[PDB]
Design an enzyme around this catalytic site. Sequence first.
Site, short mmCIF file in Angstrom:
data_model
loop_
_atom_site.label_atom_id
_atom_site.label_comp_id
_atom_site.label_asym_id
_atom_site.label_seq_id
_atom_site.Cartn_x
_atom_site.Cartn_y
_atom_site.Cartn_z
CG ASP A 14 5.15 2.65 7.87
OD1 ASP A 14 4.48 3.40 7.13
OD2 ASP A 14 5.76 3.05 8.89
CG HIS A 42 -5.50 3.38 1.75
ND1 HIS A 42 -4.37 2.72 1.32
CD2 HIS A 42 -6.52 2.92 0.98
CE1 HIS A 42 -4.69 1.88 0.35
NE2 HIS A 42 -5.99 1.99 0.13
N1 LIG Z 1 7.26 -3.66 -3.01
C1 LIG Z 1 6.07 -3.77 -2.39
N2 LIG Z 1 5.43 -2.66 -2.02
C2 LIG Z 1 4.25 -2.92 -1.42
C3 LIG Z 1 3.68 -4.15 -1.14
N3 LIG Z 1 2.48 -3.99 -0.47
C4 LIG Z 1 2.34 -2.69 -0.36
N4 LIG Z 1 3.38 -1.98 -0.91
C5 LIG Z 1 3.59 -0.53 -0.90
O1 LIG Z 1 3.94 -0.16 0.42
C6 LIG Z 1 3.30 1.08 0.78
C7 LIG Z 1 2.38 0.85 1.96
O2 LIG Z 1 1.29 0.00 1.56
P1 LIG Z 1 -0.27 0.37 1.90
O3 LIG Z 1 -0.47 0.31 3.37
O4 LIG Z 1 -1.10 -0.53 0.95
O5 LIG Z 1 -0.45 1.87 1.40
P2 LIG Z 1 -0.98 3.16 2.16
O6 LIG Z 1 -2.27 2.71 2.90
O7 LIG Z 1 -1.21 4.26 1.13
O8 LIG Z 1 0.07 3.49 3.23
C8 LIG Z 1 2.60 1.57 -0.48
O9 LIG Z 1 3.44 2.50 -1.17
C9 LIG Z 1 2.34 0.27 -1.26
O10 LIG Z 1 2.24 0.43 -2.67
C10 LIG Z 1 4.40 -5.33 -1.53
O11 LIG Z 1 4.11 -6.50 -1.27
N5 LIG Z 1 5.59 -5.03 -2.18
MG LIG Z 2 0.58 0.51 5.47
#
Ligand SMILES: Nc1nc2c(ncn2[C@@H]2O[C@H](COP(=O)(O)OP(=O)(O)O)[C@@H](O)[C@H]2O)c(=O)[nH]1
Ligand SMILES: [Mg+2]
EC number: 6.3.4.4
Lengths: 394, 394
Positions: A14, A42
Amino acid sequence: MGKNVVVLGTQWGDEGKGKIVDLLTQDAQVVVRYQGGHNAGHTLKITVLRLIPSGMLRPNVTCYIANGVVLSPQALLSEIKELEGNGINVRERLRISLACPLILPYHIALDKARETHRGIGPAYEDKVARRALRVGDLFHRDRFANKLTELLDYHNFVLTQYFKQPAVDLESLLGESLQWAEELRPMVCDVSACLHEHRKQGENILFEGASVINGAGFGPRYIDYVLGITKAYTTRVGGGPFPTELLDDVGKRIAERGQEFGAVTGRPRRCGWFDAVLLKRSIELNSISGLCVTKLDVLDGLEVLRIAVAYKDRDGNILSRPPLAADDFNDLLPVYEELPGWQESTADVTVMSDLPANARAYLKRIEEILGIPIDMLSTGPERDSTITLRGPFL
Amino acid sequence: MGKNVVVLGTQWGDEGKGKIVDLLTQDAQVVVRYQGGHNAGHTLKITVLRLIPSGMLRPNVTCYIANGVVLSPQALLSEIKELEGNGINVRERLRISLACPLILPYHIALDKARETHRGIGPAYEDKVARRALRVGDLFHRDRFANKLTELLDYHNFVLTQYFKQPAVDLESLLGESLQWAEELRPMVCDVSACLHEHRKQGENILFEGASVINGAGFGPRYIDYVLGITKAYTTRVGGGPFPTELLDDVGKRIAERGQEFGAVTGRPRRCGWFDAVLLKRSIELNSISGLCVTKLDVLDGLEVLRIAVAYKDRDGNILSRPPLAADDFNDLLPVYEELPGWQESTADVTVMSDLPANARAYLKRIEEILGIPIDMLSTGPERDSTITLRGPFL
Ligand SMILES: Nc1nc2c(ncn2[C@@H]2O[C@H](COP(=O)(O)OP(=O)(O)O)[C@@H](O)[C@H]2O)c(=O)[nH]1
Ligand SMILES: [Mg+2]
Ligand SMILES: Nc1nc2c(ncn2[C@@H]2O[C@H](COP(=O)(O)OP(=O)(O)O)[C@@H](O)[C@H]2O)c(=O)[nH]1
Ligand SMILES: [Cl-]
Ligand SMILES: [Cl-]
Ligand SMILES: [Mg+2]
């Protein structure tokens, strides 16, 4: 000559890796999945991808599923067909190793029989035991059927005799596998040879961790940079030891602001302070070159921040790495440094000098403690709310 | 700061790695076994070692058996006791990962039951299935016994029911394991942490291949040089494809001069020309930095030498790498270059300029074809009949 970059998370999942990989694919001509299966997904723009790299949405990128991936053929074909519906020419740019082990119904069954005392584990077990059916076997239908019946004579014995659970029907598995060879044929190849030809052509290659050496047939000295995706605080989903866990109003605030909830269950994740003891071990194991610190914006408004810089075990011994054995976490406590927080918003800031002074000092201290630079920083969920201080493909 | 060197063979075994590792240990302060078990031995001065690195015979060297090694505790303790008889202080300089999986009687049995349709395979299977007993479990005798009985309830079922072979007796296994914890206790540790402290202290570390990243907990960018031990011709022990195999008087001469006979069976190994198609794939998979070419002296007196530079498959397609599938070796032929041999003796020559011109041209052509340098050369069985053109620890 190109650069070969591995991207992985440094904590307990996460960490926000998805949008960072998506951003990095702007610089890659090649993206490689080399480990794992379809366990984690993703989400992106148009659709959840679990096996197909997101580089597929860039028209110039070739995507590789290398031999270290164990794949369910029906899960892959459904992702393919989904992307084809959105008008992506998948089969021209997706390549699949002939040596990937298959995940088949009986692997999932052995998973289920064992949980009650998604097949990824039993598939890797078959592989280690030199008995796994692989992608390449689909192209010798005689051998595929012979090996499948023979494998099922064992796994069905174990399922019904040992576990007292239902068997897996051979005939229905042959029926469902009838079209797989023709569906996959234009995409199957010697992935490692392809990767080394790309390397020879000087193309940038991104290895997307869900090891590289065995899983993609790609020797360690060709790895130019390992990017460690690292959330600005720690989360955990499961039970067990969590030395920096927060059980108070600060942890609840972090959970809310970071939307730290199970994507399927809705259950809140455990939250806690940044843990540099955990990170030191991750950096050593993976020879991490630089960090991408994520979700800095979640910490906006906290009065104080803590970083665990050591552990103290039951005897009061000071540990710089997490103990190997889970027993040793009993009566084990973090040793903290305390830093001041910031009140100003860091959300979607895209130049370091717009960050509050206490935010830059927090990040600087993480760098000092861990001894490697923070080369990237995410300040929001949008792909472009990202500061690149040094590009991994430099 | 020190250098971290991996040494491995590039062909199908028997490349002459033993004396090269022994020589390299003069420059290492640390030697690490990170893969495999006790399958192959190494003979040296005083005694055959299969688990303990030969660096143990240098007084300053610390030897590590890292987590990737699966070990039989009784095989290890016998090697220890043997070296102790020759007056080596083993327990002070041998270190063993708490996370090594154990090889136990039932693993060997499953090996035997399966051969008739040394336990290393079934031990790795237990590990992948998250059920392997490990070194660390010896130190919780309650848990060791509980897990052993529970594991045996399964493996004995499989042995007697499925394979119709004898079971393994739980009580006699507990009896034989009674002293293992106390025997091993002063040597067990967190090997990966130790290796990273050595790395921090700037000490030279030698990884002795029988991967490094997972098997020793040691990230890929810390690997400074991969030395590929490469015999000047090719041998094979088993059946199956051997494109450069020689079935004539030249192969018989090579076999005799190179003493290419099974150490236990006495059966002659299959011999053949140097195969650079094989080597190109080995170099890619392992990112080999330089070669150590061995047994050059065996080729003295040949009128001509051949090097396979490509394969031609059944359709006449030209291949630069060995095919993945063994089917494709059917009606597959090597493409040779021919070089003149030499009549002068190269035995125990220790300066390049004393080699005959045709010998240096043979080696130069291998370098040109493979694109990496020959940094070391063995011209005889004695440890010091070795030319070091560039030291791996440079
Ligand atoms: N507030 C915030 N949320 C983030 C950031 N980077 C990613 N997210 C969110 O955290 C969650 C996990 O990120 P990611 O691994 O990119 O998404 P996934 O691959 O769909 O699990 C998603 O809902 C993203 O939008 C950040 O720097 N700030
Ligand atoms: Mg992630
Ligand atoms: N003629 C010749 N024999 C060699 C050379 N290098 C090693 N050998 C011999 O080849 C065999 C295999 O070498 P090595 O791996 O060092 O020994 P092992 O570990 O006991 O199998 C041994 O009998 C060595 O003495 C060499 O360059 N020339
Ligand atoms: Cl492949
Ligand atoms: Cl360890
Ligand atoms: Mg050898």
